């Protein structure tokens, strides 16, 4: 896969978790099969791409919830789809904060 997903909405569900949704259309990827998505997130106060943590979801969901985050903290969030051939480009990068 080459073209990545597109994060459509992100928001804080509470003090330690964030909800996000996204869209995706193949044909831009020749309709290749998709075996899931990687959701990357990192404390905004970091600028090093080695600080992103990673979550796995199946290619059958358009939304997800990132748990075990820090209260009242800002996070950079981006994602990518993938198959047995590797990962796609990163989606747009969204900045979302949790609850106080």
């Amino acid at each position: 896969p080459v073209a990545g997903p597109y994060i459509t909405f992100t928001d804080a569900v509470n003090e330690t978790t964030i909800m996000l949704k996204w869209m995706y259309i193949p044909a831009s990827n020749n309709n290749t099969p998709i075996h899931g998505f990687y959701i990357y997130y990192r404390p905004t106060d970091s600028d090093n791409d080695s600080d992103y943590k990673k979550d796995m979801v199946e290619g059958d969901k358009y939304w997800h919830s990132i748990s075990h985050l820090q209260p009242e903290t800002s996070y950079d969030i981006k994602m990518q789809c993938f198959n047995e051939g590797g990962e796609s480009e990163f989606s747009n990068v969204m900045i979302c904060e949790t609850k106080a």
Binding site: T10, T44, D45, D47, E72, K78, N92, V93, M94, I95
Partner: protein
């Protein structure tokens, strides 16, 4: 030689009026995309003494208006003069990722989310005051994680 200032309190803004008023930054004029005719009104800021987050890897943060650029460029001097060894940091400039409330001045490259390169939030109050004195038409301690700045059109 650093100067003695009056820090802005969290969630405070200056001038003391809504951002979209004439006494502040003015009204929203439309969302600038790459395809937008007005996109060409955005110059990239390549100041060596400004740290740009650019977590998008698109250099979108550097994109802003000539006015936002002048106000920003002189704040970079104000910050180094205040805390020698510390630089101005930008976390958000013009935006096309879309996590900002509709009619956000980020979509027009007229606003910036700023911090201190060391992320010492105790410096943010002062940082906000500096932005005000740097000529920024609107300054707003928007979050614990960043200060909000914007300019007219």
């Amino acid at each position: 030689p650093p100067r003695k200032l009056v820090p802005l309190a969290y969630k405070q803004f200056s001038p003391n009026v809504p951002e979209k008023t004439l006494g502040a930054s003015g009204r929203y004029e439309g969302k600038i995309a790459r395809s937008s005719e007005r996109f060409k009104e955005l110059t990239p800021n390549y100041n060596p003494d400004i740290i740009f987050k650019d977590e998008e890897n698109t250099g979108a943060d550097r994109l802003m208006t000539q006015r936002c650029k002048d106000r920003l460029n002189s704040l970079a001097i104000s910050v180094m003069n205040q805390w020698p060894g510390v630089k101005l940091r930008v976390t958000e400039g013009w935006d096309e990722d879309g996590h900002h409330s509709e009619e956000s001045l980020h979509y027009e490259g007229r606003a910036v989310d700023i911090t201190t390169s060391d992320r010492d939030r105790n410096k943010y109050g002062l940082l906000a005051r500096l932005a005000v004195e740097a000529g920024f038409d609107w300054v707003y301690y928007e979050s614990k994680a960043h200060v909000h700045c914007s300019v007219k059109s």
